Write a protein that binds this ligand. Sequence first.
Ligand SMILES: OC[C@H]1O[C@H](O)[C@@H](O)[C@@H](O)[C@@H]1O
Length: 163
Amino acid sequence: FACKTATGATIPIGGGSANVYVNLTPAVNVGQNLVVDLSTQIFCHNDYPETITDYVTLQRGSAYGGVLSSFSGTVKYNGTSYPFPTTTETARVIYDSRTDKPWPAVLYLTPVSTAGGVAITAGSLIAVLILHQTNNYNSDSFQFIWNIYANNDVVVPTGGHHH
Ligand SMILES: OC[C@H]1O[C@H](O)[C@@H](O)[C@@H](O)[C@@H]1O
């Protein structure tokens, strides 16, 4: 079992870490959800599907930068919504093919009530997600650590008399 990003960063058998750079909607209005769909950027495969079934969860997710300071939200993993930051492991997804399959993780993040102005800066680390892989074959338990960086600034528009 190993994983890669659409841009070509890889994490090999046994786990490791990689960086994922994401485009974000540049203005996230109050009450709205900024959606970070990692299933278009992170893909994984099973190296021995004839004999081994791989089980993959989101084990932990932490918030950073502007997301930590100015957003609240959830992570939708394989269709079920969990808190984000996430300290409790999710249900599992089965990987059973040598063909790359998306990792079905999507962040839904809404600005907190005191947000306003620049909330996320380009290049900043905004999230870390731990993909946990086990299987039905041996004792392997591996962590694939995805560092999620913003490709662009995100602003929460404000009102007032200054524009
Ligand atoms: O993907 C099938 C199998 O491949 C390798 O042996 C290791 O990555 C295992 O942990 C995994 O279960």
